[PDB]
């Protein structure tokens, strides 16, 4: 699978990052993870805070 924001690694990791255009067009790397599900859940948090409420995440339901 390819979560929208999780970049699986060739070593068995997953970087959870979200795009932040409100920050002068900068990047927001939440942090690497052990699986795409862990980096995906973390992306949801940074995708709900940056988008306030109602946003598009990998898991649109279980926060």
Residue 32: strand, helix, or coil:
strand
**Cα 30 to Cα 14: distance, rounded to the nearest angstrom:** 11
**Cα 2 to Cα 53: distance, rounded to the nearest angstrom:** 23
Structural domains present in the chain: 1-63 (3.30.730.10)
CA distances from 31 to 21, 54 (A): 19, 23
**Cα 38 to Cα 52: distance, rounded to the nearest angstrom:** 21
Instruction: Tally Cβ neighbours within 10 Å of residue 35.
Output: 13
């Amino acid at each position: 699978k390819h979560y929208r924001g999780v970049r699986q690694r060739p070593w068995g990791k997953f970087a959870a990052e979200i795009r932040d255009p409100a920050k002068n067009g900068a990047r927001v790397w939440l942090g690497t993870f052990e699986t795409a599900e862990d980096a995906a859940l973390a992306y949801d948090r940074a995708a709900f805070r940056m988008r306030g409420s109602r946003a598009l995440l990998n898991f649109p339901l279980r926060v």
